[PDB]
């Protein structure tokens, strides 16, 4: 039952972009504990029990460019 921390650099030009990312993560409740989105750092932090590859894939399918990701 590990709650992992993933961090992504996601290009988000406006609040609609943060909204697109938030939306796909809401569909993965109740196994997403916390999300943090910063437009000022272009960063998305996801705290979840789900696998890294799956989270990355779902964010990428928004069409918002994912520049990089890592586990913390
Ligand atoms: Hg946007």
From Swiss-Prot:
GO biological process terms held by the UniProt record: cellular response to oxidative stress; copper ion transport; intracellular iron ion homeostasis
Native species: Saccharomyces cerevisiae (strain ATCC 204508 / S288c) (Baker's yeast)
Regulation: Tetrathiomolybdate directly and reversibly down-regulates copper delivery to secreted metalloenzymes.
GO CC term, one of those recorded: cytosol
Family, as annotated: Belongs to the ATX1 family.
Subcellular location: Cytoplasm
Binding site for Cu(+): 14, 17
Protein name: Copper chaperone ATX1
Higher taxonomy: Eukaryota, Fungi, Dikarya, Ascomycota, Saccharomycotina
Entry GO MF terms: copper chaperone activity; metal ion binding
Pfam families reported for this sequence: HMA (PF00403)
